[PDB]
Design a protein around this nucleic acid. Structure first.
Ligand SMILES: Nc1ccn([C@H]2CC[C@@H](COP(=O)(O)OP(=O)(O)OP(=O)(O)O)O2)c(=O)n1
Ligand SMILES: [Mg+2]
Ligand SMILES: [Mg+2]
Ligand SMILES: [Mg+2]
Ligand SMILES: [Mg+2]
Ligand SMILES: [Mg+2]
Length: 539
DNA sequence: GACCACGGCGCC
DNA sequence: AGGGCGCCGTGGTC
């Protein structure tokens, strides 16, 4: 390319180099642009950022985030990564995408700009005639990138003092548990080491080993194994409690307070748009899609996610979302009839599990029923079902049998989906998002069957993901107009922040947008709460 | 200081 | 031998 002075003309493709992967934390080391057979390198990258009207190119959203951090409105546009990800969601990295579609991902901005341009040309060619994938690009993924950039740059407020205090408290309880474990083992060892614990439990204390690990075939110490040994030796209960607390402390209580950004005073995640096989988003650095919620100890951590002063959080969660999608995709008249009748499958299963009326089911019980319902749907074994329900193996089988006999069109939809996957090499969502699943004709049964479970899950999880994305795209402009913010997405949930004076209206509107995004054969239902913190906003 | 593989486990 | 993720500490290694 011809070297030309900065700035580039409008419409140019950008290349950029960051000091680290997180745009909210990165130094912008270099910036360049390419168009029309020319490359333009910025003498000073931060100054030069002001000259761009759009971020067009590889990882455009990341540059947009850094621009927003600096007070600039630089929306992301075309990004070859999104085209590639739609063609095949195994396309998750710029290294891999460049090699597959025509170049090399280097560490120089001018080269990255030129690469972006040529990758765009080639990948745009590949999507010609792929009308459904093009619709996803234009109506979902490209506009969504701008939404994600605003979410990332906005961040969420954290009660740091509350978590710092919690660390001190949890440490004392951890020490009580470890001391007891070491007393019972008769010696000290590294309780965080699963290899050392294995030896202590199964060789020294002579407890029965129940299961093996996946890759290395050691005797497992996982919670399901420990649960089955709780009455076999008092050490087991202590270990379970120790793991609960150390998990909370090491993963959430200690790390999160140290990640407050010095300028925003908030915590900033990354919402990765080309990271999953199904079309879901993921969140990283830190992951805010797995903040604890199940146990009362984990719940305390959610209290730390708070609204700005004078604002409230608004939490919206699609009800029974994948079950509704399955009713639409399969066309099962009976499953559709459940949602037309306003019933709740999770509550119904919980009533059975715990042996109480529907009205006696509490939130803890209902949540427990979710793993069972989704587990069974996507191929859980009778053995495992019998294990985490503490019931005979026989009535676990029968429960699985009763499940599929109630909704006949589901088995048929599974069989069609799998034959299509074998024939075409991919399965697809309602909107035509694809996942290639090559091991569907593997001759090793366990491998083949695992591939089948991946394959028929994807249209369901992926259609739910497509719906949530479309809802975000539609909702975002409306929030902006009301002076509200979108903070987090957690797969089938959104967390917004609204001024107190507007929070009730924002909740009503966001519910409506989410319910009406793309009607199915069954209504979509959304539960919405408002509160000072994330725990209170979901109650 | 890092990379990776693993087991383990937090959420959806 | 439920599906999708990312992060922990350990262990091995460079
Ligand atoms: N153990 C789980 C939990 C969740 N999911 C997937 C399927 C539903 C989706 C969203 O999770 P939830 O909101 O917790 O499930 P829900 O059915 O929408 O329940 P709720 O009515 O409480 O929102 O995630 C899953 O595959 N396995
Ligand atoms: Mg407040
Ligand atoms: Mg839900
Ligand atoms: Mg949810
Ligand atoms: Mg390091
Ligand atoms: Mg490596």
């Amino acid at each position: 390319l011809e070297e030309a002075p900065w700035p580039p003309p409008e419409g140019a493709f950008v290349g950029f180099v960051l000091s680290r992967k997180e745009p909210m934390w990165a130094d912008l080391l270099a910036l360049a642009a390419a168009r029309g057979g020319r490359v333009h390198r910025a003498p000073e990258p931060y100054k030069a950022l002001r000259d761009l009207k759009e971020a067009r190119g590889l990882l455009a959203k990341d540059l947009s985030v850094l621009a927003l951090r600096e007070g600039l409105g630089l929306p992301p546009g075309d990004d070859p990564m999104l085209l590639a990800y739609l063609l095949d969601p195994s396309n998750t990295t710029p290294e891999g995408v460049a090699r597959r579609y025509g170049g090399e991902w280097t560490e120089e901005a001018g080269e990255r700009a030129a690469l972006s341009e040529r990758l765009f040309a080639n990948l745009w060619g590949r999507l010609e005639g792929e009308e459904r994938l093009l619709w996803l690009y234009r109506e979902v993924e490209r506009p969504l990138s701008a939404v994600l950039a605003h979410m990332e740059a906005t961040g969420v407020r954290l009660d740091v003092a509350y978590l710092r205090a919690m660390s001190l408290e949890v440490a004392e309880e951890i020490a009580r548990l470890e001391a007891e474990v070491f007393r019972l083992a008769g010696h000290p060892f590294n309780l965080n080491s699963r290899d050392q614990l294995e030896r202590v439990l199964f060789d020294e204390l002579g407890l029965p080993a129940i299961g093996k690990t996946e890759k290395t075939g050691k005797r497992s110490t996982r919670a399901a194994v420990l649960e089955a040994l709780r009455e076999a030796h008092p050490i087991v209960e202590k270990i379970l409690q120790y793991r609960e607390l150390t998990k909370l402390k090491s993963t959430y209580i200690d790390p999160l307070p140290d990640l407050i950004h010095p300028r925003t005073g908030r915590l900033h995640t990354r919402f990765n748009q080309t990271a999953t096989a199904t079309g879901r988003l993921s969140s990283s650095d830190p992951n805010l899609q797995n903040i604890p919620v199940r146990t009362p100890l984990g719940q305390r951590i959610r209290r730390a996610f708070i609204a700005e002063e004078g604002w409230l959080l608004v939490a919206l969660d699609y009800s029974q979302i994948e079950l509704r999608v399955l009713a639409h995709l399969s066309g099962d008249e009976n499953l559709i009839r459940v949602f037309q009748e306003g019933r709740d499958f999770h509550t119904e299963t919980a009533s059975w599990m715990f042996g109480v009326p529907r009205e006696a089911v509490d939130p803890l019980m209902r949540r427990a029923a979710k793993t069972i319902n989704f587990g069974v749907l996507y191929g859980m074994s009778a053995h495992r079902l019998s294990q985490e329900l503490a019931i005979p193996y026989e009535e676990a089988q029968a429960f699985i049998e009763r499940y599929f006999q109630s909704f006949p069109k589901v088995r048929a939809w599974i069989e069609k989906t799998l034959e299509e996957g074998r024939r075409r090499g991919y399965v697809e969502t309602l909107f035509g998002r694809r996942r290639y699943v090559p091991d569907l004709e593997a001759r090793v049964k366990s491998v083949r069957e695992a591939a089948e479970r991946k394959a028929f899950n994807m249209p369901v999880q992926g259609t739910a993901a497509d719906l949530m994305k479309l809802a975000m795209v539609k909702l975002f402009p409306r929030l902006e107009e009301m002076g509200a913010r979108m903070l987090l997405q957690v797969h089938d949930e959104l967390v917004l922040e609204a001024p107190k004076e507007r929070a009730e209206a924002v909740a009503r509107l966001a519910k409506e947008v989410m319910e009406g995004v793309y009607p199915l054969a069954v209504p979509l239902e959304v539960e919405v709460g408002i509160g000072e913190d994330w725990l209170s906003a979901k109650e």
